[model samples]
Target: VWEDTDLGLYKVNEYVDVRDNIFGAWFEAQVVQVQKRALSEDEPCSSSAVKTSEDDIMYHVKYDDYPEHGVDIVKAKNVRARARTVIPWENLEVGQVVMANYNVDYPRKRGFWYDVEICRKRQTRTARELYGNIRLLNDSQLNNCRIMFVDEVLMIELPKERRPLIASPSQPPPALRNTGKSGP
Candidate 1:
């Protein structure tokens, strides 16, 4: 459900925060809603049906600052709708501890962030032919947690330097400025 809009691409309706190491700009965002257009009639209830059920569910996710963009709502889409052999939630019992990455900002610091296990995993759900959802012990923010494996999780890490150069106040090169005076 990736679409190009005025705002950036939205993958889901979750609270996401980004850290800009180069510019040192850190901000928090709350994804209010996700846009989706029905694909077909049969798979209306299924979130993954938007893309596969012939009737695509187009999404428009809202953010705090950046413009709202489109993204897939179902986690199953991330894995190409393939069923994994081993489910992590099935092996866990109540009060089991697990390590997870948390997005946080360094207070009064230039460049420093850490990943810590804020809470223990308490509840878990196992779904046949689909990814399971897990809940943290005391985390109210993320109650309906979708269990994501190590490979599935997109680790948000700050690069040593910015990869793609962004446009700034700098002027364009001289070669690009010349455009054959006025075509006769």
Candidate 2:
């Protein structure tokens, strides 16, 4: 049996990606429960108004990969719908925001998905590859990281709907300084 809020938040038992508070990275998770807290006094609302906002909703989820960590309560803002669509390399472009598998520690191994802003692309008669900056929750990045799973790169799921389209970064990260003075 499955249940969901009227606001269309992730339903119970649904798979999702929740941002880990400690690592500042997103990981696959399963919704175990959903609850709505009392509305704050600052917002003007009646019963109908109370039902429409997702700000008060919380999802209790267990990380699919690390269940030993126990369940976590996550706000809607920290939970994203699972990315399911695979974008073909021929259709990809620089400046698009996507969720890609990147292992910062070991670039060759399969790793967790990170929100990446496509910074560069490569195309040849023989090979296709992509490179981007991994946008972490703290607004920092693993810049110019090569995506290991270019063939498995997925579209970032937008909140509230399944609209398959290109998404662009609102503000791209600053350029890396390459001055001769590397002794900063």
Candidate 3:
């Protein structure tokens, strides 16, 4: 069983939203970031040293569920991607797997809502790490399963399930009431 901490801060709620909207489904996100370095040890390498220097664009990413809500300006190098498709960021290859709420609009009839699953992934990047491509697997519903969004996603985890049906202790079942009075 996967723990909650495994999911990152920025994407924690998104993952829950996906899982709740779709039963028996798990969602994972890829996070990436870019970093900079000097050519020699003597060269200055702090953000303060490069007050006018341009920032690097390379992203270092990973398959993490941890949330990145209110962090610092460390420039630790990170970016985030969320989809039912694979999205590669930096050297890390976010494998093929996605979970999300999907809505299909039609000309006639109520819009169809579903939780999606991306079962497969393929990735390729240039030698410079400047660009890449990601392909998602098993996109069609014919191969995948579908369920009512309301039934699957809208309900929260219940705290207790064994409580009594009656709201008040004084109330009695209707079947036990006497309908007739006897004469002496």
Candidate 4:
């Protein structure tokens, strides 16, 4: 799904957003269409959501993650695709609830929404413990490679199980700038 077009690296069936024409708003929607300009023919738009210009392609989308409206169109840059990356440890701070994987075997909770590892911690921890046990889950987040830290720890003294946390799936984290050392 990571196809880098002029707009951004997103593909068909990827979840994204389009600008709402009526107001100063944006809606989360799936990518239903990606219309490229004909370097040949003049393609007339039949729908109001679709916009055509000599410069760029329009990303047409359908709404309602709960579509109170019909189809809407936007630029590729406006398509907000969820990235397969994790938040940096330094950026994570207090009062933020994070997604922690659980210690359960396969088949226990297969393909269920509330089934798998989802242990959230709104708890407080030292900077040492924070950086030490923590690691990134750039993809396939919220799974069990269970490593528990009952107390504080240093990075060098990391426990055998590196049980790490991720941003909640309902709201994945913002894109990270640096390509650091594994992680959502």
Candidate 5:
């Protein structure tokens, strides 16, 4: 019950949030092609063979903003439904972890998506702001990072069946990191 049943297959032309290895962020993309690789007959029977079921599925995707990069081939784990839900400022607590768009170099400009644990929240007559720790893919961490897209902060959606019944503020889930390739 901890996994999504509908995530098994994706159709061509469907819009998805693709994990960009270069920026270590998720971006909107359109699936251009879908294919499955045939399994070899001589597959190893050892326990270390690793599960290869989902690995067979492949997707050709085109980034919505970076079309100049051309269509890229990605595995099933590299894409998911786009994150569209935004959490309200009042309901957001300091300990809650959420996904947000931020840029370390330029705080005003839109940067990459990251999993941030809310450490502080501030509001003024004109603005609402949040500060949090950024969890990196390498297990390294950044503290008190400024979140730029406060209104656009998204609630990380686990598989429907795996969703928690009540919002657990005390213990948030771990960082949402993907196992896809990391390109320089």
Candidate 6:
């Protein structure tokens, strides 16, 4: 995927390859000079494969997936942009209860992954929306059910049975080991 580039004009999202001595190969990297990363404090004490500079500020990109390959300056001449794809999620709505893979942190909590009814989606203040602050079925021992973006949480399908597969229709289905019995 490496081709040609111009210094400081390569732009974000473009992939490049920097020659690495450790791996003895051309290491592929993506140019991610984010505005926030620009303000990040430089850690010069890090290894040559992962050091941030003061003057010639450039992100030391990973040569590959693992921690090996060796990081280094990918020459601008070795950079080029390519087409990318985005993922889509199902439509989200209120009333139907759902379980986000992670905790009430909206349907997720102090727990790893939690489920919650999508009670409501409050209006977002910014035009660019990533996540939403939601109301959960909890009234006590809970905070605002802030959740992942619309496409983030996994959508759960429910059956039209009298006794729902879950114990509490309002709350998420936590690890319940009880048999579906009325009472002894």
Which numbered prediction scores highest in TM-score against the true structure?
Answer: 2
Clashes of each: 10, 0, 18, 8, 0, 13
Off by over 4 Å in 3: 1-97, 107-113, 125-140, 144-184
lDDT of 3 by residue, 1-184 (tens): 1111111222212211112122323233222322333333444344332111223222233222333542212221122222222233322332223222333433233322233333322335642221112112334343333322222222121112211122124332222111111345
Off by over 4 Å in 6: 1-90, 103-111, 123-144, 161-184
Writing each residue's lDDT as its tens digit, candidate 6 over 1-184 gives: 1211113423443343333333222233544441112322444334232222223325444434432655544443332221112122334455554434343232322223234456555554554222433333343323345556544343433211111121233332232211111223
Candidate 4 vs candidate 5, TM-score winner: 5
Off by more than 4 A, model 5: 1-9, 36-56, 68-70, 89-97, 117-133, 137-139, 143-149, 158-184
Error of 6 at 44 (Å): 83
Predictions: Cα RMSD each = 19.6, 11.9, 22.8, 17.5, 11.2, 22.2
Q: Write the per-residue lDDT of candidate 4 for residues 1-184, one digit (tens) a residue.
A: 1122223234445555343333223344655555654332325534333223323556556654434665666665454443233333444443332222222223333210111122333334743333122223232333333324422111211111211222345553343222111222
Better of 2 and 3 by TM-score: 2
lDDT of 2 by residue, 1-184 (tens): 1223244456665666776666566676766677665535544444433233445568887665456987888888788766656666767877877776555544545545667888888889997667888776556887777776755576666665522222233421122111111122
Candidate 4 residue spans exceeding 4 A from truth = 1-9, 19-26, 40-55, 65-68, 90-184
Off by over 4 Å in 1: 1-13, 18-26, 42-108, 111-184
Relative to the true structure, how large is the alpha-carbon lDDT of every model? 0.29, 0.62, 0.26, 0.35, 0.60, 0.35
| lDDT of model number 1 | 0.29
Q: Model 2 Cα displacement at 126 (Å)? A: 4.3
Task: Rank the candidate models, highest TM-score first.
Answer: 2, 5, 4, 6, 1, 3
